[PDB]
Amino acid sequence: GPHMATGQDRVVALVDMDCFFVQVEQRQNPHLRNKPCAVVQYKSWKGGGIIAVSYEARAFGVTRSMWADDAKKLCPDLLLAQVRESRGKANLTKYREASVEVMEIMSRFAVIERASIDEAYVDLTSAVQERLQKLQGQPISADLLPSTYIEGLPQGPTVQKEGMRKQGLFQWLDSLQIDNLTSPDLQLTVGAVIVEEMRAAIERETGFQCSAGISHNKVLAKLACGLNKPNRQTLVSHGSVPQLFSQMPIRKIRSLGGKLGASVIEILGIEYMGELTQFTESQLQSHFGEKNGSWLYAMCRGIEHDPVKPRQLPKTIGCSKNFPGKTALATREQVQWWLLQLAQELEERLTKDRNDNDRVATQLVVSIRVQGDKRLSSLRRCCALTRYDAHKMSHDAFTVIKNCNTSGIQTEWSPPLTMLFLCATKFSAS
DNA sequence: ATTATGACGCT
DNA sequence: AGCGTCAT
Ligand SMILES: Nc1nc2c(ncn2[C@H]2C[C@H](O)[C@@H](COP(=O)(O)NP(=O)(O)OP(=O)(O)O)O2)c(=O)[nH]1
Ligand SMILES: [Mg+2]
Ligand SMILES: [Mg+2]
């Protein structure tokens, strides 16, 4: 009771751009604004593969990983934008630049952990404390939280969504104002005020809309963020966790969407995150290992300690291309030519990186997939990255993998390669 | 023919 | 160092 930690020590937010690549294309081409739209890679095969979908298009059932030709059957008026293609591969530069715009703004408010091209975690604990002092005990107005949902509210004794949002917010604030709500709850509330400000700054300065989650840890903040997309933010308090998790499928939680999550469900015979609470830590550790067990025991109670790492830049810089089915690379000249295309793009990105961020990568990782192999990578080899030189990088990459070629003939390559992937890693100060 | 390419744990 | 998981 007295001595039990409740995991309410921090205020953490997760900010994620709405249909990010689509908004980047919509900003540049106003014709696409406010319309069912998607972003695809390539064009020849089935119209290209969709990787981003505007909310207008999602209403027709359009989804990521759908072929554009197929999406067009669901949504005849779907507008498409295709990622830039350079050297015969996808070139995501425009979205990486857009990403920097957003990350730079977020970094003004607080320490952030870049989690993906379109999202960052924010540790707002200190910022909250500072605002609480400036506030001097002033009541927090609903006006300061124009886009915030309080998960779990309203409750008790609204037909329209904005009506529900407001009633929930009023219930929440009226309880904070009375003083019934905990200090952790006040802290989350101030975090939400700051996040409103962060999101307003992002929209004003970039034109991009986003959603956000505010809670006491990264897992809950990420979960919260997705609850009310698009263009809204959600506050998930410690107290909201029991009801929220009671019907929350285990696969919903970050890190549990794959094999581990499936084994939890299968071994324990449960469906929802809340059901995890009936097991002892030791039980969970025995089934899922010491680290995962401990993590699950705390998580199902809404507690997680993974820190927001101070990292605004990616740890690696890489590029890859698949060669599916019949296009699989089958000659030595072919492998080398594509290795050079990958290396050239990478050299460009690495040079820019060195200039902007005062660092140099020192290791080059080469990954390939062989035909018939389900795995992401069939083989990984590394060499020293001593020069930002595409010819040298591609030549070195070839040197470390050329062994894989079973065929006696130099010209032929077997087994055929279904992916090439060059990753620059092990950065150091420059 | 689910592509491009990230972080990160285990050994 | 080299492979497996989770992600979208
Ligand atoms: N190349 C590539 N890019 C991808 C892929 N999947 C996603 N992206 C790119 C395109 C995405 O726009 C972007 C951000 O990823 P999300 O935040 O997961 N989805 P979004 O922001 O689109 O919508 P919302 O958050 O409102 O649901 O990453 C992929 O499989 N391949
Ligand atoms: Mg997003
Ligand atoms: Mg995202």
Tab-separated table of C-alpha atoms (C1' of nucleotides) and ligand atoms in Angstrom:
chain	number	residue	atom	x	y	z
A	1	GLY	CA	0.000	0.000	0.000
A	2	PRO	CA	2.199	2.816	1.324
A	3	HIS	CA	5.365	1.440	-0.271
A	4	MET	CA	4.051	0.378	-3.653
A	5	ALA	CA	5.245	2.317	-6.702
A	6	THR	CA	2.415	3.375	-9.016
A	7	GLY	CA	4.505	4.388	-12.021
A	8	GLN	CA	3.280	7.977	-11.858
A	9	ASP	CA	6.714	9.589	-11.594
A	10	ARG	CA	6.945	10.941	-15.171
A	11	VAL	CA	4.923	12.830	-17.744
A	12	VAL	CA	5.541	11.344	-21.177
A	13	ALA	CA	3.930	12.251	-24.487
A	14	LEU	CA	3.966	10.573	-27.887
A	15	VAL	CA	3.394	12.804	-30.907
A	16	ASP	CA	2.591	11.129	-34.230
A	17	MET	CA	1.846	12.832	-37.551
A	18	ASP	CA	-1.500	12.043	-39.163
A	19	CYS	CA	-1.169	10.153	-42.489
A	20	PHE	CA	2.307	11.698	-42.676
A	21	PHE	CA	3.552	11.075	-46.260
A	22	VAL	CA	0.096	12.056	-47.568
A	23	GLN	CA	0.185	15.386	-45.686
A	24	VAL	CA	3.660	16.046	-47.090
A	25	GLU	CA	2.296	15.546	-50.624
A	26	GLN	CA	-0.896	17.518	-49.849
A	27	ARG	CA	1.089	20.494	-48.554
A	28	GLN	CA	3.132	20.569	-51.773
A	29	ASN	CA	0.140	19.921	-54.077
A	30	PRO	CA	-2.983	21.742	-52.829
A	31	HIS	CA	-5.117	19.796	-55.367
A	32	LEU	CA	-4.827	16.744	-53.118
A	33	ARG	CA	-5.931	18.519	-49.942
A	34	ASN	CA	-9.078	17.255	-48.197
A	35	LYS	CA	-9.520	14.378	-50.621
A	36	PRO	CA	-9.168	10.607	-50.549
A	37	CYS	CA	-5.453	10.271	-51.324
A	38	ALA	CA	-2.662	7.731	-50.864
A	39	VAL	CA	1.061	7.516	-51.328
A	40	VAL	CA	2.495	4.568	-53.253
A	41	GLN	CA	5.947	3.238	-54.129
A	42	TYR	CA	6.549	2.345	-57.789
A	43	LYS	CA	3.859	2.154	-60.478
A	44	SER	CA	4.287	-0.745	-62.941
A	45	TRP	CA	3.131	-3.562	-60.702
A	46	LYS	CA	-0.529	-3.238	-59.827
A	47	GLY	CA	-0.228	0.551	-59.736
A	48	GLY	CA	2.235	0.497	-56.851
A	49	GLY	CA	2.140	-0.410	-53.168
A	50	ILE	CA	0.342	1.923	-50.776
A	51	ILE	CA	2.300	3.081	-47.703
A	52	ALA	CA	0.142	6.027	-46.518
A	53	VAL	CA	-3.613	6.771	-46.670
A	54	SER	CA	-5.593	9.966	-45.976
A	55	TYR	CA	-8.470	9.600	-43.527
A	56	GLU	CA	-10.895	10.419	-46.343
A	57	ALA	CA	-9.592	7.359	-48.219
A	58	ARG	CA	-9.563	5.143	-45.114
A	59	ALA	CA	-13.344	5.648	-44.964
A	60	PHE	CA	-13.570	3.674	-48.238
A	61	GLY	CA	-11.521	0.848	-46.742
A	62	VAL	CA	-8.193	1.874	-48.277
A	63	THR	CA	-5.235	0.601	-46.240
A	64	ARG	CA	-1.459	0.450	-46.137
A	65	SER	CA	0.072	-2.456	-48.072
A	66	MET	CA	-2.855	-2.455	-50.497
A	67	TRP	CA	-2.067	-2.386	-54.218
A	68	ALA	CA	-3.146	0.901	-55.776
A	69	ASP	CA	-5.102	-0.951	-58.483
A	70	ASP	CA	-7.009	-2.734	-55.709
A	71	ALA	CA	-7.590	0.446	-53.657
A	72	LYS	CA	-9.019	2.083	-56.798
A	73	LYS	CA	-11.713	-0.612	-56.810
A	74	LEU	CA	-12.768	0.449	-53.302
A	75	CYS	CA	-12.325	4.136	-53.959
A	76	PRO	CA	-12.704	5.064	-57.667
A	77	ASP	CA	-11.835	8.733	-57.038
A	78	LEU	CA	-8.689	7.936	-55.027
A	79	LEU	CA	-5.861	10.349	-55.823
A	80	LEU	CA	-2.346	8.946	-55.759
A	81	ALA	CA	1.080	10.455	-55.199
A	82	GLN	CA	4.147	8.333	-55.847
A	83	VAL	CA	7.370	8.514	-53.907
A	84	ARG	CA	10.273	9.931	-55.867
A	85	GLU	CA	12.305	7.271	-57.659
A	86	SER	CA	16.081	7.675	-58.012
A	87	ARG	CA	18.597	5.215	-59.442
A	88	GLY	CA	15.770	2.750	-59.956
A	89	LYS	CA	14.800	2.754	-56.273
A	90	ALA	CA	12.541	4.539	-53.818
A	91	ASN	CA	13.891	7.873	-52.606
A	92	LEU	CA	12.324	8.997	-49.332
A	93	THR	CA	14.330	12.228	-49.028
A	94	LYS	CA	11.303	14.546	-49.146
A	95	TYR	CA	9.725	12.823	-46.120
A	96	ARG	CA	13.012	12.769	-44.192
A	97	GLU	CA	13.282	16.539	-44.725
A	98	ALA	CA	9.674	17.005	-43.617
A	99	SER	CA	10.500	14.873	-40.566
A	100	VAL	CA	13.348	17.196	-39.558
A	101	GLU	CA	10.963	20.198	-39.735
A	102	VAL	CA	8.725	18.563	-37.148
A	103	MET	CA	11.429	17.139	-34.869
A	104	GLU	CA	13.161	20.525	-34.652
A	105	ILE	CA	9.973	22.197	-33.419
A	106	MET	CA	9.304	19.477	-30.830
A	107	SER	CA	12.899	19.763	-29.590
A	108	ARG	CA	12.209	23.384	-28.566
A	109	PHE	CA	9.776	22.274	-25.869
A	110	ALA	CA	11.665	19.299	-24.463
A	111	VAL	CA	14.068	16.391	-24.788
A	112	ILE	CA	12.705	14.065	-27.445
A	113	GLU	CA	13.319	10.522	-28.567
A	114	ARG	CA	12.839	10.201	-32.323
A	115	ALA	CA	10.943	6.925	-32.593
A	116	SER	CA	10.169	6.878	-36.328
A	117	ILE	CA	10.158	9.129	-39.383
A	118	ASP	CA	6.889	10.683	-38.080
A	119	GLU	CA	6.845	10.348	-34.271
A	120	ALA	CA	8.783	11.256	-31.134
A	121	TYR	CA	8.430	10.641	-27.425
A	122	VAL	CA	8.678	13.679	-25.149
A	123	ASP	CA	9.705	13.648	-21.486
A	124	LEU	CA	7.677	16.563	-20.106
A	125	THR	CA	8.266	15.967	-16.402
A	126	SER	CA	10.508	19.020	-15.939
A	127	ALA	CA	8.496	21.264	-18.250
A	128	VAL	CA	5.373	20.422	-16.227
A	129	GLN	CA	7.036	21.378	-12.940
A	130	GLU	CA	8.108	24.735	-14.396
A	131	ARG	CA	4.621	25.557	-15.701
A	132	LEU	CA	3.025	24.594	-12.375
A	133	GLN	CA	5.167	27.235	-10.626
A	134	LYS	CA	4.420	29.945	-13.195
A	135	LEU	CA	0.749	29.072	-12.909
A	136	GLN	CA	0.826	29.725	-9.157
A	137	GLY	CA	-2.209	27.546	-8.450
A	138	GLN	CA	-4.372	29.084	-11.170
A	139	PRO	CA	-7.301	26.894	-12.265
A	140	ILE	CA	-6.904	25.121	-15.623
A	141	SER	CA	-9.524	26.274	-18.123
A	142	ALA	CA	-11.159	23.983	-20.684
A	143	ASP	CA	-10.086	26.592	-23.239
A	144	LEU	CA	-6.478	25.469	-22.775
A	145	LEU	CA	-7.394	21.958	-23.948
A	146	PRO	CA	-9.397	22.435	-27.172
A	147	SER	CA	-8.461	19.044	-28.694
A	148	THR	CA	-7.918	16.837	-25.639
A	149	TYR	CA	-9.833	13.652	-24.801
A	150	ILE	CA	-9.767	12.230	-21.291
A	151	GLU	CA	-9.796	8.452	-21.726
A	152	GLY	CA	-12.572	6.827	-19.694
A	153	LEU	CA	-14.669	10.000	-19.398
A	154	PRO	CA	-17.399	11.018	-19.352
A	155	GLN	CA	-18.929	8.486	-16.973
A	156	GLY	CA	-22.291	8.354	-15.203
A	157	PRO	CA	-25.174	10.720	-16.044
A	158	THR	CA	-23.249	13.750	-25.859
A	159	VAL	CA	-24.852	12.301	-29.000
A	160	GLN	CA	-22.095	14.055	-30.979
A	161	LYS	CA	-18.397	13.307	-30.578
A	162	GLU	CA	-17.351	16.864	-29.695
A	163	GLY	CA	-20.113	16.804	-27.070
A	164	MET	CA	-18.678	13.658	-25.512
A	165	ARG	CA	-15.165	15.134	-25.574
A	166	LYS	CA	-16.202	18.298	-23.751
A	167	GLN	CA	-18.331	16.571	-21.111
A	168	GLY	CA	-15.439	14.236	-20.342
A	169	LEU	CA	-13.028	17.150	-20.142
A	170	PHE	CA	-15.381	19.121	-17.864
A	171	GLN	CA	-15.798	16.150	-15.537
A	172	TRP	CA	-12.009	15.801	-15.423
A	173	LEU	CA	-11.261	19.482	-14.798
A	174	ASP	CA	-14.086	19.877	-12.265
A	175	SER	CA	-12.526	17.039	-10.284
A	176	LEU	CA	-9.023	18.540	-10.551
A	177	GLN	CA	-10.413	21.930	-9.520
A	178	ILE	CA	-12.054	20.430	-6.436
A	179	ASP	CA	-8.762	18.752	-5.549
A	180	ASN	CA	-10.099	15.209	-5.600
A	181	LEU	CA	-7.682	14.266	-8.404
A	182	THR	CA	-4.100	13.226	-7.596
A	183	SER	CA	-0.919	15.278	-8.095
A	184	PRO	CA	-0.013	12.843	-10.896
A	185	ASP	CA	-3.354	13.724	-12.522
A	186	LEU	CA	-2.626	17.452	-12.343
A	187	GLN	CA	0.798	16.797	-13.824
A	188	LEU	CA	-0.680	14.884	-16.766
A	189	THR	CA	-3.173	17.720	-17.260
A	190	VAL	CA	-0.422	20.339	-17.477
A	191	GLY	CA	1.453	17.988	-19.815
A	192	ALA	CA	-1.645	18.033	-22.025
A	193	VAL	CA	-1.678	21.840	-22.009
A	194	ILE	CA	1.950	21.877	-23.178
A	195	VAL	CA	1.217	19.218	-25.817
A	196	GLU	CA	-1.662	21.366	-27.139
A	197	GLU	CA	0.948	24.134	-27.533
A	198	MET	CA	3.458	21.797	-29.207
A	199	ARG	CA	0.853	20.574	-31.693
A	200	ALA	CA	-0.277	24.156	-32.416
A	201	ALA	CA	3.342	25.115	-33.119
A	202	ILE	CA	3.799	22.150	-35.442
A	203	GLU	CA	0.653	23.011	-37.392
A	204	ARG	CA	1.406	26.721	-37.634
A	205	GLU	CA	5.014	26.268	-38.684
A	206	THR	CA	4.746	23.253	-41.016
A	207	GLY	CA	1.071	22.957	-41.956
A	208	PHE	CA	1.072	19.343	-40.756
A	209	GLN	CA	-1.541	18.010	-38.326
A	210	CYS	CA	-0.747	15.387	-35.722
A	211	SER	CA	-2.169	13.497	-32.792
A	212	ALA	CA	-0.670	12.836	-29.375
A	213	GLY	CA	-0.917	10.661	-26.298
A	214	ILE	CA	-0.129	11.908	-22.806
A	215	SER	CA	0.486	9.515	-19.920
A	216	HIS	CA	3.104	8.380	-17.385
A	217	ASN	CA	5.169	6.192	-19.710
A	218	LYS	CA	5.932	5.512	-23.386
A	219	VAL	CA	3.699	2.436	-23.855
A	220	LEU	CA	0.608	4.227	-22.522
A	221	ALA	CA	1.406	7.453	-24.383
A	222	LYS	CA	1.715	5.524	-27.660
A	223	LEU	CA	-1.517	3.641	-26.964
A	224	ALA	CA	-3.260	6.917	-26.046
A	225	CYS	CA	-2.154	8.683	-29.213
A	226	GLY	CA	-3.987	6.221	-31.450
A	227	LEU	CA	-7.252	6.341	-29.498
A	228	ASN	CA	-8.524	9.571	-31.070
A	229	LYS	CA	-6.708	10.129	-34.375
A	230	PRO	CA	-6.780	12.218	-36.430
A	231	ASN	CA	-5.902	15.731	-35.195
A	232	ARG	CA	-6.649	15.076	-31.494
A	233	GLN	CA	-4.738	14.226	-28.303
A	234	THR	CA	-5.693	11.764	-25.551
A	235	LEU	CA	-4.800	11.784	-21.852
A	236	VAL	CA	-4.566	8.325	-20.277
A	237	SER	CA	-4.328	8.541	-16.501
A	238	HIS	CA	-3.163	5.854	-14.114
A	239	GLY	CA	-6.767	5.487	-12.942
A	240	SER	CA	-8.090	4.858	-16.453
A	241	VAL	CA	-5.893	1.750	-16.870
A	242	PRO	CA	-8.020	-0.987	-15.229
A	243	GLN	CA	-11.061	-0.281	-17.424
A	244	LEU	CA	-8.996	0.447	-20.553
A	245	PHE	CA	-6.988	-2.785	-20.253
A	246	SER	CA	-10.015	-4.923	-19.285
A	247	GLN	CA	-11.025	-5.276	-22.953
A	248	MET	CA	-7.740	-4.338	-24.604
A	249	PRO	CA	-6.459	-7.133	-26.874
A	250	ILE	CA	-2.899	-8.065	-25.967
A	251	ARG	CA	-1.659	-7.476	-29.545
A	252	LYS	CA	-2.509	-3.778	-29.122
A	253	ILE	CA	0.343	-3.111	-26.731
A	254	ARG	CA	3.686	-2.074	-28.187
A	255	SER	CA	6.004	-5.107	-28.528
A	256	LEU	CA	3.183	-7.652	-28.147
A	257	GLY	CA	1.895	-7.591	-31.720
A	258	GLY	CA	4.095	-10.513	-32.761
A	259	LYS	CA	5.290	-13.911	-31.508
A	260	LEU	CA	5.668	-12.925	-27.833
A	261	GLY	CA	2.108	-11.597	-27.695
A	262	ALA	CA	0.781	-14.719	-29.394
A	263	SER	CA	2.573	-16.926	-26.867
A	264	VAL	CA	1.174	-14.904	-23.972
A	265	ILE	CA	-2.326	-15.484	-25.322
A	266	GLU	CA	-1.749	-19.177	-26.092
A	267	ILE	CA	0.199	-20.196	-22.965
A	268	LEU	CA	-1.849	-18.227	-20.427
A	269	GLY	CA	-5.185	-18.741	-22.182
A	270	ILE	CA	-6.187	-15.053	-22.091
A	271	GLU	CA	-7.271	-12.355	-24.561
A	272	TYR	CA	-6.993	-9.035	-22.776
A	273	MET	CA	-4.166	-7.095	-21.186
A	274	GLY	CA	-6.023	-6.813	-17.884
A	275	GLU	CA	-6.149	-10.582	-17.431
A	276	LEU	CA	-2.360	-10.525	-16.946
A	277	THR	CA	-2.816	-9.130	-13.435
A	278	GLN	CA	-3.903	-12.524	-12.019
A	279	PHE	CA	-0.411	-13.983	-12.474
A	280	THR	CA	2.580	-13.612	-10.166
A	281	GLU	CA	5.723	-11.986	-11.521
A	282	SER	CA	7.528	-15.315	-11.084
A	283	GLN	CA	4.891	-17.121	-13.141
A	284	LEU	CA	5.284	-14.643	-15.990
A	285	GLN	CA	9.063	-14.871	-15.751
A	286	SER	CA	8.991	-18.676	-15.974
A	287	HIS	CA	6.944	-18.659	-19.168
A	288	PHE	CA	8.380	-15.628	-20.937
A	289	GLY	CA	11.812	-15.064	-19.404
A	290	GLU	CA	12.959	-12.767	-16.603
A	291	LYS	CA	12.994	-9.500	-18.577
A	292	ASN	CA	9.689	-10.076	-20.389
A	293	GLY	CA	8.019	-11.447	-17.259
A	294	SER	CA	8.983	-8.419	-15.157
A	295	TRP	CA	7.912	-6.133	-17.978
A	296	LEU	CA	4.520	-7.844	-18.358
A	297	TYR	CA	3.840	-7.838	-14.611
A	298	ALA	CA	4.354	-4.078	-14.392
A	299	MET	CA	2.807	-3.218	-17.793
A	300	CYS	CA	-0.583	-4.861	-17.203
A	301	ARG	CA	-0.768	-2.580	-14.137
A	302	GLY	CA	0.011	0.462	-16.297
A	303	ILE	CA	3.621	0.648	-15.154
A	304	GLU	CA	6.648	0.879	-17.455
A	305	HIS	CA	10.089	2.352	-16.795
A	306	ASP	CA	11.675	2.585	-20.256
A	307	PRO	CA	13.134	6.110	-20.366
A	308	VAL	CA	12.645	8.682	-23.103
A	309	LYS	CA	16.144	8.594	-24.606
A	310	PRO	CA	17.747	11.900	-25.660
A	311	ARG	CA	18.116	11.020	-29.328
A	312	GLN	CA	16.868	13.296	-32.093
A	313	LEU	CA	18.888	11.550	-34.811
A	314	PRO	CA	18.728	8.040	-36.289
A	315	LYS	CA	21.438	5.617	-35.077
A	316	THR	CA	21.881	4.136	-38.560
A	317	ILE	CA	21.535	5.305	-42.170
A	318	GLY	CA	20.480	2.668	-44.666
A	319	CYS	CA	18.810	1.885	-47.947
A	320	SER	CA	17.425	-1.275	-49.472
A	321	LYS	CA	15.649	-2.722	-52.478
A	322	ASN	CA	13.764	-5.982	-52.933
A	323	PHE	CA	13.949	-7.988	-56.165
A	324	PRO	CA	10.835	-10.201	-55.926
A	325	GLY	CA	10.087	-13.311	-57.968
A	326	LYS	CA	11.402	-13.200	-61.516
A	327	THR	CA	13.376	-9.973	-61.053
A	328	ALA	CA	15.692	-11.671	-58.539
A	329	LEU	CA	19.328	-10.803	-59.346
A	330	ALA	CA	21.027	-13.656	-61.184
A	331	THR	CA	24.286	-12.274	-62.597
A	332	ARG	CA	27.459	-10.854	-61.071
A	333	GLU	CA	27.199	-7.706	-63.179
A	334	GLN	CA	23.635	-7.191	-61.947
A	335	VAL	CA	24.480	-7.531	-58.261
A	336	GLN	CA	27.362	-5.096	-58.623
A	337	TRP	CA	25.296	-2.557	-60.540
A	338	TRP	CA	22.571	-2.453	-57.895
A	339	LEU	CA	25.150	-2.389	-55.098
A	340	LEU	CA	26.455	0.753	-56.765
A	341	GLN	CA	22.986	2.341	-56.973
A	342	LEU	CA	22.417	1.678	-53.258
A	343	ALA	CA	25.906	2.947	-52.377
A	344	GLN	CA	25.424	6.144	-54.380
A	345	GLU	CA	22.208	7.085	-52.556
A	346	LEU	CA	23.849	6.185	-49.249
A	347	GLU	CA	26.949	8.291	-49.952
A	348	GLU	CA	24.648	11.248	-50.608
A	349	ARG	CA	22.765	10.784	-47.338
A	350	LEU	CA	25.970	10.181	-45.381
A	351	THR	CA	27.656	13.315	-46.737
A	352	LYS	CA	24.614	15.402	-45.840
A	353	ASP	CA	24.537	13.743	-42.396
A	354	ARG	CA	28.177	14.553	-41.701
A	355	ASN	CA	27.573	18.201	-42.698
A	356	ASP	CA	24.404	18.683	-40.639
A	357	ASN	CA	25.187	16.566	-37.588
A	358	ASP	CA	28.954	16.541	-37.073
A	359	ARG	CA	29.421	12.767	-37.187
A	360	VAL	CA	30.772	10.001	-39.402
A	361	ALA	CA	29.697	6.379	-39.708
A	362	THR	CA	32.550	3.921	-39.298
A	363	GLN	CA	30.904	0.592	-40.137
A	364	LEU	CA	29.119	-0.618	-43.257
A	365	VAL	CA	26.689	-3.506	-42.904
A	366	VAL	CA	25.691	-5.509	-45.969
A	367	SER	CA	22.525	-7.601	-45.837
A	368	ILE	CA	21.063	-9.823	-48.550
A	369	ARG	CA	18.096	-12.122	-48.991
A	370	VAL	CA	18.286	-15.210	-51.182
A	371	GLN	CA	15.388	-16.477	-53.270
A	372	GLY	CA	13.066	-18.817	-51.401
A	373	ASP	CA	13.997	-17.364	-48.025
A	374	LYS	CA	11.110	-15.982	-45.947
A	375	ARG	CA	13.507	-14.134	-43.630
A	376	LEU	CA	14.138	-10.387	-43.880
A	377	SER	CA	17.843	-11.155	-44.183
A	378	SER	CA	19.519	-14.391	-45.252
A	379	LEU	CA	23.006	-13.089	-44.505
A	380	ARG	CA	24.695	-10.113	-42.854
A	381	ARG	CA	28.330	-9.112	-43.291
A	382	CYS	CA	30.197	-5.967	-42.290
A	383	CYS	CA	33.316	-4.055	-43.243
A	384	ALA	CA	35.009	-0.805	-42.292
A	385	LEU	CA	33.403	2.364	-43.615
A	386	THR	CA	36.505	4.525	-43.982
A	387	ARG	CA	35.447	6.778	-46.863
A	388	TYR	CA	32.163	8.223	-48.081
A	389	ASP	CA	32.874	6.859	-51.556
A	390	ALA	CA	30.135	4.999	-53.431
A	391	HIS	CA	32.532	3.055	-55.658
A	392	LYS	CA	34.543	1.895	-52.626
A	393	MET	CA	31.474	1.103	-50.532
A	394	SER	CA	29.819	-0.927	-53.306
A	395	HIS	CA	33.097	-2.678	-54.155
A	396	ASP	CA	33.686	-3.534	-50.473
A	397	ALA	CA	30.061	-4.654	-50.072
A	398	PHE	CA	30.513	-6.980	-53.013
A	399	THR	CA	33.773	-8.342	-51.597
A	400	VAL	CA	32.139	-9.456	-48.332
A	401	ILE	CA	29.185	-11.270	-49.942
A	402	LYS	CA	30.709	-12.654	-53.158
A	403	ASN	CA	31.341	-15.881	-51.243
A	404	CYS	CA	27.625	-16.692	-51.106
A	405	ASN	CA	27.626	-17.381	-54.850
A	406	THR	CA	27.410	-21.174	-55.229
A	407	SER	CA	27.708	-21.222	-59.030
A	408	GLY	CA	31.183	-21.879	-60.439
A	409	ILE	CA	30.826	-19.362	-63.263
A	410	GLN	CA	31.821	-15.795	-62.404
A	411	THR	CA	29.079	-14.244	-64.515
A	412	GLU	CA	26.228	-16.244	-62.991
A	413	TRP	CA	24.964	-15.705	-59.468
A	414	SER	CA	23.152	-18.330	-57.421
A	415	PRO	CA	21.043	-18.543	-55.502
A	416	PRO	CA	19.349	-15.473	-57.021
A	417	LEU	CA	19.179	-12.467	-54.688
A	418	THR	CA	15.791	-11.093	-53.623
A	419	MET	CA	17.130	-8.122	-51.619
A	420	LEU	CA	20.148	-5.875	-51.216
A	421	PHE	CA	20.517	-3.700	-48.123
A	422	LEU	CA	23.389	-1.403	-47.179
A	423	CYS	CA	23.352	0.070	-43.691
A	424	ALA	CA	25.827	2.633	-42.350
A	425	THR	CA	26.369	2.250	-38.583
A	426	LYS	CA	28.622	2.912	-35.567
A	427	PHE	CA	28.643	6.716	-35.773
A	428	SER	CA	31.367	8.779	-34.092
A	429	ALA	CA	32.088	12.486	-33.532
A	430	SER	CA	33.449	14.429	-36.504
B	1	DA	C1'	5.086	-9.474	-56.164
B	2	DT	C1'	4.289	-6.546	-48.757
B	3	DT	C1'	8.522	-2.229	-49.829
B	4	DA	C1'	11.821	0.563	-47.442
B	5	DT	C1'	14.536	0.512	-43.444
B	6	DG	C1'	14.354	1.509	-38.489
B	7	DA	C1'	15.510	-0.042	-33.148
B	8	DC	C1'	17.112	-3.620	-30.564
B	9	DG	C1'	17.341	-8.291	-27.995
B	10	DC	C1'	19.890	-12.878	-27.870
B	11	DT	C1'	23.906	-15.529	-28.548
C	1	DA	C1'	30.146	-10.701	-35.052
C	2	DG	C1'	25.832	-12.561	-36.993
C	3	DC	C1'	20.959	-13.704	-36.439
C	4	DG	C1'	15.907	-12.943	-34.770
C	5	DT	C1'	11.910	-9.878	-33.416
C	6	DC	C1'	8.827	-6.004	-33.845
C	7	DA	C1'	7.502	-2.211	-36.430
C	8	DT	C1'	4.650	0.071	-40.415
D	1	LIG	N1	8.732	2.782	-47.192
D	1	LIG	C1	7.745	2.591	-46.251
D	1	LIG	N2	7.262	3.709	-45.587
D	1	LIG	C2	6.278	3.377	-44.692
D	1	LIG	C3	5.805	2.047	-44.451
D	1	LIG	N3	4.799	2.042	-43.471
D	1	LIG	C4	4.663	3.326	-43.115
D	1	LIG	N4	5.550	4.203	-43.817
D	1	LIG	C5	5.646	5.693	-43.771
D	1	LIG	C6	4.429	6.360	-44.454
D	1	LIG	C7	3.657	6.927	-43.241
D	1	LIG	O1	2.867	8.033	-43.515
D	1	LIG	C8	4.751	7.207	-42.204
D	1	LIG	C9	4.396	7.306	-40.683
D	1	LIG	O2	3.958	6.033	-40.267
D	1	LIG	P1	2.522	5.755	-39.516
D	1	LIG	O3	2.602	6.898	-38.462
D	1	LIG	O4	2.620	4.375	-39.001
D	1	LIG	N5	1.191	6.040	-40.469
D	1	LIG	P2	0.602	7.495	-40.975
D	1	LIG	O5	1.378	8.660	-40.295
D	1	LIG	O6	0.639	7.422	-42.459
D	1	LIG	O7	-0.869	7.616	-40.388
D	1	LIG	P3	-1.460	7.664	-38.922
D	1	LIG	O8	-0.331	7.923	-37.895
D	1	LIG	O9	-2.334	8.959	-38.793
D	1	LIG	O10	-2.184	6.381	-38.782
D	1	LIG	O11	5.723	6.198	-42.451
D	1	LIG	C10	6.384	1.013	-45.200
D	1	LIG	O12	5.962	-0.245	-45.019
D	1	LIG	N6	7.351	1.256	-46.106
D	2	MG	MG	1.578	8.604	-38.266
D	3	MG	MG	4.013	6.737	-36.779
